[PDB]
């Protein structure tokens, strides 16, 4: 039946992971450095382990979700032989270098290793909206996919064998998130000068964000072909509208560094021959240090 | 019955507007500087106006959609009494300054004036994905709402009476577009170093964009309350992740100016006391 699992880390996210495993019928053993965080899970059927060593011994699948890579090694480095024969899944946030170093670290302890990235807030764990990304040996992912999938039943993806891939994808997706939020917050500042509450702008901003998701899909073949048709706006047209957004900002006393930076990316592409190309031509300067 | 309408300007957008009006059964009069653009519309029942003056006289509702405000005034400035008593709807992209000037210019000519912003590509006109935003006198929007709605049946919004409001919304929403596309293109450059095709990344990138749209909805009450709970990520955590994105860009030989700029903005909020606040606190530095 369902694999036994251990979750190390009972912060907001780790607690959500443990609850999802337990709700799906998995034997779920939990442990946390700060005390008093396991009482509700234990009441629902989780096992509160007496130590990190006991917790790791409880299951073949060991899921870690703590503050950072330093915290991971604070828990696991003292172990001696505990991880041999197990599969370690690190859903802690970190870098690609930390992920690759962890794969080698785990291999020396006789453990399989998958790095993961949680592309979700805790309340979206175990919903159709959650996305969790994994990288490392495919055999370990395939063996535990059915257990891992409870965390993101419609969004569990193995990216490939290089253990650093999940962290790279995590940072790239965060880049999109920050692009959205900066655009929303700068626009909320701009429209707020005209008496528009952020709650009245947000439905338009969320709708437009969903529309632009489709523009991302349209852009991908252009990037892959290296061919950048203007569509309905050359980069000259984009550049002029960006200048307009900077002018609106400056006239209202709103910070204009973001629209000027956007205008600079476009202006550079224009100076390098893309005045008549579509927006996807901006990938060319993103590729060059 | 349906209002008679005139469309001035038959580029890709303007042609799509006129096509939608005509398919909905409006008397549709069209004019373009290049007459051939009207051929297919006229064959389907649109009236090819012989001149701008004839076009404007044909209908009480005059929709303009040309390259920029300079082009708008090249068409309309020569008119003499033509626009009196009519309602002019300017769907050309422009600035709030241009919109304020146009409201005055139209009133001097006895015309009601709505500024509009088309938040759609031409092929999405008249679909449920189209968004079109208007500002100007509410009574003029009311008088022609049913006609205007054919351009965006599930997306037509009057924003308010302030002459420049549609232009401000247009450019703010374009800001979101550019930030998203930059994130996608930079992420595609980054992941391309590891063998990831943009077409492989795009399903994830698009899905995550749709998720973040929900984060926008959640952020708005924080902005309006001036209270920025950390949620699951303080600005300290965000700034560190952006530093990691920049460092990874540098180590892989892709451009790091975008993540460095993101870091800079977050660091400014941190230095103003928001180390432990959530991302919405960034609104305060956008206000100065």
């Amino acid at each position: 039946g369902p694999a036994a699992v251990t979750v190390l880390g009972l912060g907001r996210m780790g607690s959500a992971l443990a609850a999802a495993f337990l709700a799906a019928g998995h034997s779920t053993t939990v442990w946390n450095r700060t005390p008093g965080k396991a009482d509700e899970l234990a009441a629902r059927g989780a096992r509160r382990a007496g130590s990190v060593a006991e917790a790791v011994a409880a299951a073949p699948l060991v899921v870690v979700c703590v503050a950072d890579d330093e915290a991971v090694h604070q828990l696991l480095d003292p172990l001696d032989g505990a991880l041999a024969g197990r599969t370690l899944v690190n859903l802690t946030t970190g870098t690609s270098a930390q992920a690759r170093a962890n794969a080698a670290w785990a291999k020396e302890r006789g453990a399989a290793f998958l790095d993961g990235a949680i592309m979700a807030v805790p309340e979206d764990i175990a919903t159709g909206d959650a996305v969790l990304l994994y990288s490392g040996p495919r055999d370990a992912f395939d063996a535990y996919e059915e257990a891992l999938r409870v965390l993101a039943p419609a969004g569990t993806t193995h990216l490939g064998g290089d253990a650093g891939l999940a962290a790279l994808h995590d940072l790239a997706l965060l880049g999109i998130m920050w692009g959205v939020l900066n655009g929303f917050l700068h626009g909320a500042a701009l429209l707020g000068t005209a008496g528009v509450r952020a709650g009245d702008f947000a439905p338009l901003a969320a709708r437009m964000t969903t529309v632009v998701a489709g523009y991302v899909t349209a852009a991908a073949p252009e990037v892959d072909a290296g061919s950048y048709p203007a569509g309905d706006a050359t980069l000259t047209v984009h550049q002029e509208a960006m200048r307009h957004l900077a002018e609106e900002s400056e006239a209202l006393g709103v910070n204009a560094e973001l629209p000027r930076f956007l205008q600079l990316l476009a202006g550079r592409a224009v100076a390098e021959g893309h005045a008549e190309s579509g927006y996807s031509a901006l990938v060319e300067q993103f590729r060059k240090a």
Side-chain angles (χ1 to χ4, degrees), chain A residues 1-138 140-249 251-259 261-289:
Chain A
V5 68
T6 284
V7 174
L8 302 181
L10 296 181
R12 270 201 82 221
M13 179 68 82
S15 292
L17 309 185
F21 285 126
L22 186 63
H26 293 266
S27 167
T28 302
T29 298
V30 300
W31 186 91
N32 192 63
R33 176 139 189 212
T34 309
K37 308 294 174 213
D39 291 345
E40 283 179 77
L41 288 159
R44 291 161 135 90
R47 167 195 287 124
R48 193 196 292 106
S51 61
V52 172
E54 269 150 293
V56 169
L61 178 62
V62 179
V63 176
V64 187
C65 183
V66 291
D68 52 24
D69 198 62
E70 157 171 35
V72 172
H73 282 93
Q74 244 164 42
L75 299 199
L76 299 183
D77 287 354
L79 302 172
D80 177 4
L83 294 165
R86 309 187 190 274
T87 295
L88 182 66
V89 183
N90 185 28
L91 299 176
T92 305
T93 295
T95 64
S96 293
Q98 284 163 349
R100 291 176 186 116
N102 284 156
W105 174 96
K107 173 211 220 141
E108 280 234 22
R109 286 158 180 258
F113 177 81
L114 293 167
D115 189 47
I118 300 173
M119 302 319 305
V121 297
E123 325 80 271
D124 287 349
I125 291 301
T127 77
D129 284 344
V131 168
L132 273 77
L133 309 177
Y134 299 85
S135 61
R138 182 75 194 213
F141 175 87
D142 287 344
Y144 292 110
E145 186 177 4
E146 188 182 344
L148 293 171
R149 191 160 289 282
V150 311
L151 309 178
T156 292
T157 295
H158 181 265
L159 296 168
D162 171 2
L165 275 168
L168 211 54
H169 279 78
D170 187 14
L171 297 172
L173 294 168
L174 287 169
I176 290 168
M177 178 185 85
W178 295 314
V180 176
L181 293 179
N182 286 350
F184 171 58
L185 297 178
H186 176 71
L190 192 73
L191 298 169
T193 73
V196 177
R197 305 161 20 71
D200 284 326
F201 177 47
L204 284 172
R207 196 176 167 166
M208 173 92 180
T209 297
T210 297
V211 167
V212 180
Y215 300 167
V216 161
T217 296
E222 282 164 16
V223 171
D224 281 335
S227 166
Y228 318 114
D232 199 42
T234 61
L235 275 168
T236 298
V237 172
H238 283 282
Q239 183 182 184
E240 256 299 271
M242 288 171 186
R243 184 187 325 261
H244 291 156
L245 177 60
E247 293 182 5
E248 304 291 340
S249 300
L252 292 165
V254 162
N255 189 267
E257 296 175 67
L258 170 55
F261 183 72
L262 305 172
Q263 191 190 332
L264 171 66
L265 298 185
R268 284 186 175 155
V270 164
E272 316 248 31
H274 291 287
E276 306 300 315
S277 306
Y279 204 83
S280 296
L282 260 55
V283 71
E284 297 219 320
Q285 68 186 281
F286 283 133
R287 295 192 202 273
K288 295 182 217 143

